[PDB]
Structures are given as structure tokens and as C-alpha cells.
Amino acid sequence: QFKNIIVTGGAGFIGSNFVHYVYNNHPDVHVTVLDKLTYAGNKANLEAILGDRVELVVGDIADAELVDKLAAKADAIVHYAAESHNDNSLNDPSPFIHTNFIGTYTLLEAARKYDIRFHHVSTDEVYGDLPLREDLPGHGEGPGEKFTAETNYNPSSPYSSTKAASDLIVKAWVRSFGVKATISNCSNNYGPYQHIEKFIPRQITNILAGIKPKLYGEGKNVRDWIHTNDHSTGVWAILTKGRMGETYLIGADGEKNNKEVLELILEKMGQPKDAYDHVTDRAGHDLRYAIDASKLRDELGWTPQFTDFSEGLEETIQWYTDNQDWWKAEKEAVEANYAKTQEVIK
Amino acid sequence: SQFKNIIVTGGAGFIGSNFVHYVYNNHPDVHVTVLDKLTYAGNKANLEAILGDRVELVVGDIADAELVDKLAAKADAIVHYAAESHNDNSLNDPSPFIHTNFIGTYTLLEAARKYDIRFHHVSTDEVYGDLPLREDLPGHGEGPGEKFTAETNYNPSSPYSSTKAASDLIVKAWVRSFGVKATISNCSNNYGPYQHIEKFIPRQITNILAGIKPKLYGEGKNVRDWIHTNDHSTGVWAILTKGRMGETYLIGADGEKNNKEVLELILEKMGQPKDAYDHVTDRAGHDLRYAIDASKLRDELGWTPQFTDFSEGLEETIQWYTDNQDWWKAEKEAVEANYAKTQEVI
């Protein structure tokens, strides 16, 4: 029900995947991507589909003058733009404060001015940490053993804290000014086009480059994995059918500890089960994340389609193997940056 | 008295100036450096009497990283009161709230991290949102969740409360991620000497003294938990010197009252008819009832409020504004004029 939408952060991982989704399934919609092209922005993620349906505008979401020019011609804003890596936020929180909070505020004021639709894309990390299933009476199935729309905010890092802060002002702008906004908090995404600084693609590409995979500590931490294609359909459902002012949780019930994920990657790529390095653990590292997506399923009828992790991972490994020119120019620089704060445990 | 050289941000304001006076009179071994921007709310007269070898006033912005670094380099603690504190102003122009409440707190946190010094964040009960009236609660206000506690979910309604809540979140993340030595306090509505005339109680008192009729938003059923600024001061001191690192403490004196009954008591004490006031346009997103359970502070730190008699406290406050008319007479006209731009008798 929208014809001219702005997608911020559309040259990144999750955002570019959403743009591809629109280009393929809703050809009647025009998309204007607003992206600053930081270390994480890549024109290659959109180059093949740029045209009458999709255009790219290079700029900052904190640039009020530019945002005003674009907002005056749109009927909706889908907001993905952000500094998204915890490890980078621990080394230098500056850009997180700027982009995640000030950037969201700038966009909210534009939505208010032109009275248009706004969907805020956020993360499950705003809720903090959860204990491992082995230490819970309900084994992870009981009340409060998973995140729900009623869970309190309790972020652990500069990244999750600035995202949570942005969630708070979006909701305040709805109650105070009647902005037409909705919010989504999603679990860990994986799939094609994810930057190699992130867990899954870092291990896959290190192996392809003849470098040892890296595991933080002993790998006890748990993440709830969801394929980006399912994140895309969830956001589209909320954008077009959601209730104004509501928050929806997106997840596919795919909890796994880092150790088992790395072991699956090694096995699929024909490597020995112990061919990896244990490395310096992350400060304030979150233990377990888990999402209860009952609300979105019940109210909007959304159902994830990529629930077979083994197959999804197999296809992801093949994509990075078939598109080595997409990441090879960044491998040395990313690993060198990590070497400044991480070393092999022994 | 473990801290000998402290910085008090926003010390030229209402609550902050009362805290500086408290330190001057009860902890003579402490030197105080006040950092205040002197906005419409800052007033040098609130500190004049005690300025000298023991208390210094430095005019500046908490977002000025260079100035903050210079002052932090010679301090052993920072007590943070600086902020844009009025909901009504935040609804008219959120800009200064974004700047001061969030960016300002971030700047101070980085300075505390660099020099590894104590940091106490002064916050509000409004970060928790709103509560139903006691007559509409199954436990009449005495049951679980019928009052705010340290476990209550954040759910701010306005630009003011959401920016304050946002600052609370990054303070907690800096503790978990970087080991910053911070504590947080969330307090109920303060009243007493030196409060700006834009606030509820002082506005009604001074309006009567100036020949202007009091103003009540709607029917005045909204409820607030009143505490005398002197008890807020001793509460912050207990948390600063004995509080557990990383913990949040709620400050309150169990004094819930509805706006209507508070205004009537004022009219009565100042010899005015019970109907000598006007009903005016209600506040957008206006919060219903606020209530604080201060058990944690009382039980764990041994703190107890001394001004539990509201009638007596209010009497002394009316007397203060009556004996110090030169302190506010010059601002009366401007404040009421600003209000007239959005408020009309109904």
C-alpha cells in the first residue's frame, strides 16, 4: 500500500536483501536507498538491480537538509541504517552515538513533518542476556525463558544500548506526536552479502583463504539464527499490515551455541573438527539470546520458510565460495583490525 | 567524605543547587566545582551565598568535551544533574533534550572512563511510564507492580522522559562493557525552595502572589509522589558513598497526591476561594499516576526521609516564595506568555 519508499542502510547486509525482495516481488514500488557507504556499505550489493525501480543516494541519515528533500517525495521510510557491530562499538562508540541515536531522531522529525509511515528495524539485543537452557527450570520453554514483547530493556554494550535508546524515542514520538510508526526486534541474521567481520561469514571466508577460524572463549554462547529472507517477509508484513505503535519480535526458533555452528561449518567444508583457534573473549559478552515470535505469527500470519539451518548454511557457504571477488579485497584488513585486540589462547 | 574534589553538573538549577548547599553545610572536607550552562533554568543566585574557596562555578556545556576533560582531570567524582527537565518544553522543541540529556551524558561517561573516577547519574521516575489510579487497581496500590520498583520496565511517554531513559541505558552499558564506577537514582516529583516558576507547585503559588489565577490541566485527577528536595539530597549522598556499583536505587517518601487536592491546599493556605482557578488544555500524552517503592534504598543503605509532612513542607515553601519575590518577579510575565501559546481556559 506504498508506492515510493525510502530504505535507509539499503547498501548493507539486511537492508540490501530487503531491497532485492521488493525489486522481485513488488515491481510496482519505487525504492530510494539512502546509504552513507561506511566500511559496511557496498555498491556491489545493489549494482545489478539499479534502474527505474531502484535508485541509490549516497548520504548521512543525520543530514537534515538531505533527509528533508527525500522525505518530501516519499510515502514511507523503512529504517535499517546503523553501526551494527558490538566489537567495533567497544573500540570506538562515537559513530554509534551519531548514527544510531541522532540519525533515528533526524528521521523521526522528518516523518512527523510530512506525516508519513515509519518502520524501525531493531535487534533482540535490546533485551540483554538469558541463562543457558541447562540452567533453567523450564529448559528454555518456560515463562520468561525467552524474549517477548513484554521483556524489559537491559542492553549490555554501546551497540545494543544505542539501538535500545533509538527504540525508546520512536515509541515516545508515537505517543507524543502520533507518528505512524512500528518497531521490529529480530534475532541473529545470516545469509548472502553479510560483511566478513561477522561470525558466520568470517569463519567461512577464513577457511577459503587458508586462515584458521576463530572462536571466542570455548564457544558456549547461544544465538537464535534466522535467514535474512525470512526477516524481509516479516518486515514487509509489519509495514503493510501492522498496528500503529506496536512492537513485533521476529525469530525462527533456531538456537545454537557458537561451538556447534563452527563445527558444522568445518565439517561441511571438509576440514578437521579441531582446525580452529580459541581467542580472547569479548568484554561483557552476552550469554544466550532467544525469541518467542508468537505475536507476529498469531496477528499477521507470518511464517518463516527457511527453518532448516543445515541447508541454509550449506547454501550460504556455497555463495561465499562462488563469489570470492566480493570479499577478497577486505580479508587482510579485517583480520588485521582484529589482531589489535584478539590473540590465540594458549 | 571519601571524595574530596567533586564536580556537580547542573548545580545552578533547582535540585542541584540544593545538593551543593547540602554538601557545603554537612561535608566541609569536600571542594565542589559546579559545571552549568546557565540556560533559562540556571540561576547564579541559587549559589551566590556559598561561592568562594569551597565552591566554584564554571559556566559551560556538559557536551563540551575539551572543557569536561580539563575539569575531570582534577576531580574524584561526578554527580550529574544537568538536563533539560520540562516535559512541556520538550513537546514544543525536542532539540535541546536530545543534545543535553543524551549527548551530554555520553560525553561525561567518556570522561569518567578516561580518568577512572566515580559517577552518579541523577534520573527520574518518569522513565517507567504511567500507572493506573489506586481505585482502579486490584490491590489499591499495595500489590505487586502497583508502584515502581527497581525491576519495573522502562516505558517513557515523552521526549523528556525518553531522552532521560536513553541516558540511563548507556550508563548501565558503560558499567558492563567498560567497568565505569557508576550508580543510578530515579526519584519522584521534588518540591521546595528555588524551583523554577514553570513547574506546577511554584507556578500556582507565584501566580497567586502576582494576582494571576492558578492553572489546572484538565480535571486534575493525575497523581504525583511528592518528596522534599532536602530528602533527595541525603538520598543521593547515601548512594554516592555507599551504593553498590552498577545498581539502580529509587528515591521516594510515600507521598502520593492528585493535582486537584494539591492546588486546593495551596489556595486554602493562601486565603483564596476554593474555585479561584482555571481549567486548561491538557498535556499531550500526559502521564496518569506515578508512585515509588523505596524499599531497596531504605533496607540496603539505611536511608530515611525527614520531611514526611507535606502540609508543613508546602507551608514553608509558600513562605519562601513570599519572602523572595525579587527572585522570580522578573520572569513571571515571560513564562505565562509562553504557556498562552498552547494553553487556553476550558
Ligand SMILES: NC(=O)c1ccc[n+]([C@@H]2O[C@H](COP(=O)([O-])OP(=O)(O)OC[C@H]3O[C@@H](n4cnc5c(N)ncnc54)[C@H](O)[C@@H]3O)[C@@H](O)[C@H]2O)c1
Ligand atoms: N546483523 C544482525 O543480525 C542484525 C539482527 C537484527 C537487527 N539488526 C539491525 O538491522 C539493521 C541492519 O543491520 P546490518 O547487519 O545489515 O548492518 P550492516 O553493517 O551490514 O550495514 C549498515 C549499513 O548502514 C549504513 N550506514 C551506517 N551509518 C549510516 C549513516 N549515518 N547514514 C546512512 N547510512 C549509514 C552502512 O553504510 C551500511 O550499508 C541495523 O539497524 C541492525 O541494528 C541487525
Ligand SMILES: NC(=O)c1ccc[n+]([C@@H]2O[C@H](COP(=O)([O-])OP(=O)(O)OC[C@H]3O[C@@H](n4cnc5c(N)ncnc54)[C@H](O)[C@@H]3O)[C@@H](O)[C@H]2O)c1
Ligand atoms: N524537578 C523534578 O521533580 C525532578 C524529579 C526527578 C528527577 N529529576 C532530575 O533531576 C535533575 C535536575 O532537575 P531540576 O529540576 O533541578 O532541573 P532544572 O531545570 O531546575 O535545572 C537544570 C539545570 O541544568 C543546567 N543545564 C541544562 N542544559 C545544560 C548543559 N547542556 N550543560 C550544563 N548545564 C546544563 C541548567 O542551566 C539548570 O541549572 C535532572 O536530571 C532531572 O531529570 C528532576
Ligand SMILES: Cc1cn([C@H]2C[C@H](O)[C@@H](COP(=O)(O)OP(=O)(O)O)O2)c(=O)[nH]c1=O
Ligand atoms: C566475529 C566472531 C564472533 N564470535 C561469536 C561472538 C557471538 O557470541 C557470536 C556472534 O557474534 P557477531 O557476529 O559479532 O554477532 P552479535 O554480537 O550481534 O550476536 O559469535 C566468535 O566466536 N568468533 C568471531 O570471530
Ligand SMILES: Cc1cn([C@H]2C[C@H](O)[C@@H](COP(=O)(O)OP(=O)(O)O)O2)c(=O)[nH]c1=O
Ligand atoms: C505546570 C503545570 C502542571 N500541571 C500538572 C501536570 C502534571 O501532572 C503535574 C506536574 O507537572 P510538572 O511540574 O510539569 O512535573 P512533571 O511533568 O515532571 O510531573 O502538574 C498542571 O495541572 N498545571 C500547570 O500549570
